[PDB]
């Protein structure tokens, strides 16, 4: 057994895991759409009530048994051992489109290495038609079908989405994106080549650059004309919108996604921690750091949006007609194109996005490797490198389909599914199993032995009263509202929803399949069949 080494290593690694590429655009969009400037209070309430306890429970579970994401269940509740496979498939599905977005960002960074940014003007070949969506319009002009030059650069040069008619006409593979994703994959492989030592060494570098980059971006945005309007927009309470449970559900989903319990990463990271490590302080520090990082990201995003709106002489939120991964590569692309310092700030922002994605990718791959390996302890000789190569190859094969010209469609389909109810249901299953079958009193005694003091009654009542209730409420709300995907001038067909539902179900279906397998594999009567799978196996 190997430990994390330095305590700061685990803290930095889990902090880098907490910060995500999707935490810079989804959070501002969900705060603007629901709640507004008053969205912080329901967000904080939902956080305190249901996200920090889940993080603490996952950290304690990882630190106690020092096992992966499949053997922990076998140690606590063998009847629910399919959670590891569900976590693995969820991580693979996420990592496909995640590496696709990494390739897109790397291509943007490579193309942003010239003195003149290619998306400033629409005189290039990829930009063809509408060019009336510009900055500082001296003369009045308005067309109902205008397209920004940055949008043309993103959708016709990087993505080349104009060559595909949607999910049906999915043909052609971009070689530049292929090379970028190959370099990203080999960088990831070299980062987690040996084990957690190299992972911590690279986290020490790629987890501090994003923070100074964000500080530079904030100080640049503050000294801009019109940043005050964006500041008021981000800080304009709307208490009338807080009277329905939709905003609370959205805030709970956002905080659960940001903290990320049940992803199979916290358990693996805490498995490498010392037995006498205080997980309470670590969990609290990580939670507050992630919350402040999300708040700063929302601040800078809204400041940039307000500056853009002031430059376009119009109210804010009118320059954000599309929400998602394209929001960055459109709005920020235009902002840096109009910025006095274009190349430097564009490169800095692209490097920030690259690091943000890379940290999460290392965390997920390390968690998957730990989960797969800990099931087979007899492979500690020279199997780590082979397993890393295998998981890298699997991720590459999964992202190959997303690497196509029309890969943005499948990337968005995965991101809306690959990340959603499939992970929340897994987290709910984990929590319900731990707090009903393993026993809340047993877990409290275990964590007291770990630290030295019994946990307070607040967590004891929370884990059994409000966390599963909030999780099941989130699941019910999400399952009762079918999604309506909308990419650039394209409406997802009916069969796309069915495909998304089936791929989302294929992850959650692991738990019932393992339940049936354990029921049909454990000899005994009908009543003793469940009993065997509930009591933990003797060491």
């Amino acid at each position, epitope marked *: 057994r190997e430990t994390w080494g330095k305590k700061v290593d685990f803290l930095l690694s889990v902090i880098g895991y907490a910060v995500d590429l999707g935490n810079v655009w989804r959070f501002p969009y969900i705060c603007y759409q629901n709640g507004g400037g008053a969205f912080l209070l329901p967000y904080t309430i939902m956080a305190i009530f249901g996200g920090i306890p889940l993080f603490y429970m996952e950290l304690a579970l990882g630190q106690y048994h020092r096992n992966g994401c499949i053997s922990i269940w076998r140690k606590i509740c063998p009847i629910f051992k399919g959670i590891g496979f569900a976590i693995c498939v969820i991580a693979f599905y996420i990592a496909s489109y995640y590496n696709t977005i990494m390739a897109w960002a790397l291509y943007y960074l490579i193309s942003s290495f010239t003195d003149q940014l290619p998306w400033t003007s629409c005189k290039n*070949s*990829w930009n063809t038609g509408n060019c009336t969506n510009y900055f500082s319009e001296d003369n009045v002009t308005w067309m109902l079908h205008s397209t920004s030059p940055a949008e043309e650069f993103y959708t*016709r040069h990087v993505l*080349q989405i104009h060559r595909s008619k949607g999910l049906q006409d999915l043909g052609g593979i971009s070689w530049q994106l292929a090379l970028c994703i190959m370099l990203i994959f080999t960088i990831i492989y070299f980062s987690i080549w040996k084990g957690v030592k190299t992972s911590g060494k690279v986290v020490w570098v790629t987890a501090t650059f994003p923070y100074i980059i964000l500080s530079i971006l904030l100080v640049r945005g503050a000294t801009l004309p019109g940043a005050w309007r964006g500041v008021l927009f981000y800080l304009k309470p709307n208490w009338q919108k807080l009277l329905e449970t939709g905003v609370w559900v959205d805030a709970a989903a956002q905080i659960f996604f940001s903290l990320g319990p049940g992803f199979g990463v916290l358990l693996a990271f805490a498995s490498y921690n010392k037995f006498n490590n205080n997980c309470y302080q670590d969990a609290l520090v990580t939670s507050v750091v992630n919350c402040m990082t999300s708040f700063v990201s929302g601040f800078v995003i809204f400041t940039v949006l307000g500056y853009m709106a002031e430059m376009r002489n119009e109210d804010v939120s009118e320059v954000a007609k599309d929400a998602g991964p394209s929001l960055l590569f459109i709005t920020y692309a235009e902002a840096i194109a109009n910025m006095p310092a274009s190349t430097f700030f564009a490169i800095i922002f692209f490097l920030m996005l690259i690091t943000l994605g890379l940290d999460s990718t290392f965390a997920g791959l390390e968690g998957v490797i730990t989960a797969v390996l800990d099931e087979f302890p007899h492979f500690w000789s020279k199997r780590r490198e082979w397993l890393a190569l295998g998981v890298v190859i699997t991720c590459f094969l999964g992202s190959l389909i997303t690497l196509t010209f029309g890969g943005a469609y499948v990337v968005k389909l995965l991101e809306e599914f690959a990340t959603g109810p499939a992970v929340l249901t897994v987290a709910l299953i984990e929590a319900v199993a731990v707090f009903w079958f393993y026993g809340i009193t047993q877990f409290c005694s275990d964590v007291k032995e770990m630290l030295g003091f019994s946990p307070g009654w607040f967590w004891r009542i929370c884990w059994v009263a409000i966390s599963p209730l909030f999780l099941v409420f989130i699941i019910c709300s999400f399952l009762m509202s079918p999604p309506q995907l909308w990419l650039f001038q394209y409406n997802y067909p009916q069969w796309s929803i069915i495909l998304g539902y089936c791929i989302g179900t294929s992850s959650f279906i692991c738990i019932p399949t393992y339940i049936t397998y354990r029921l049909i594999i454990t000899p005994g009567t009908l009543k003793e069949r469940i009993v065997k799978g509930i009591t933990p196996e003797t060491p």
Partner: antibody, heavy 118, light 110 residues
Framework: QVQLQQSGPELVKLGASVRISCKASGYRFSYSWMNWVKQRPGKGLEWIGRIYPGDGDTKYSGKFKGKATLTADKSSSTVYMQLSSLTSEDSAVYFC??????????????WGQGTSVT | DIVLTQSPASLAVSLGQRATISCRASESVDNYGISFLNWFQQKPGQPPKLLIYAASNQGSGVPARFSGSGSGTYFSLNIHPMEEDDTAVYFCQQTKGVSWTFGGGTKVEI
């Protein structure tokens, strides 16, 4: 409708210079490349360069980097063209054209009238 | 500077006979699904007129008889049927993002 107007023919002595303009109207002047071609008497066409009125970026194909200069004036919605060190070898007719959109492969659909330069 | 060669240099095609003109470049002109090659046609003492853009789509004021097709390196332009007013020189030109070059042209007689 898109109409391109060109000046009449001129006479150039040995080592003199000429100035050729091209008035563009009826469309977005600042969002369409302006390119000029050279047609020798009895011979084929010859591209001479292009210029973007909205950005002022000029591109040269052959050895006309120091021989031909392209300037644009958005105030009057016209594109100018200047040639230096003109001899009898280039005693041809120079045309003016506007490039189309990118999705049409920078089509050279609209032409001018051509000026007979001696 | 992509070099474009047009063959044959002179075509002798009468009424009722298909007139196929093909010019081959040196490098591929397809980058985003559009072939950066256009075909022109000029009469003696007349400005040239665009016939087809992107080597696959007909122009605005161009008769449907000036059909063209091709992708990659080889492009073809066929006129069927053709009249006595088609005895004009046809030029094919590339529109790459670095430099543009013109061909040689075919002298169509009758």
């Amino acid at each position: 409708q898109v109409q391109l107007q060109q000046s009449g023919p001129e006479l150039v002595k040995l080592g003199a210079s000429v100035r050729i303009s091209c008035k563009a109207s009826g469309y977005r002047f600042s969002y369409s490349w302006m390119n000029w071609v050279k047609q020798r008497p009895g011979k084929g066409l010859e591209w001479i360069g292009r210029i973007y009125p909205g950005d002022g970026d000029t591109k040269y194909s052959g050895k006309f980097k120091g021989k031909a200069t392209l300037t644009a004036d958005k105030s009057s919605s016209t594109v100018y063209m200047q040639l230096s060190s003109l001899t009898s070898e280039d005693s041809a007719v120079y045309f003016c054209a506007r490039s189309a959109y990118g999705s049409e492969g920078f089509a050279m659909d609209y032409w001018g009238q051509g000026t007979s330069v001696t | 500077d992509i070099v474009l060669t047009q063959s044959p240099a002179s075509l002798a095609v009468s009424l009722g006979q298909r007139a196929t003109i093909s010019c081959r470049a040196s490098e591929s002109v397809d980058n985003y699904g559009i072939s950066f090659l256009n075909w022109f046609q000029q009469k003696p003492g007349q400005p040239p007129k665009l016939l087809i853009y992107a080597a696959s789509n007909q122009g605005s004021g161009v008769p449907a008889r000036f059909s063209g097709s091709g992708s990659g390196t080889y492009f073809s332009l066929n006129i069927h049927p053709m009249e006595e007013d088609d005895t004009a020189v046809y030029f094919c030109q590339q529109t790459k993002g670095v430099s543009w070059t013109f061909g040689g042209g075919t002298k169509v007689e009758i």
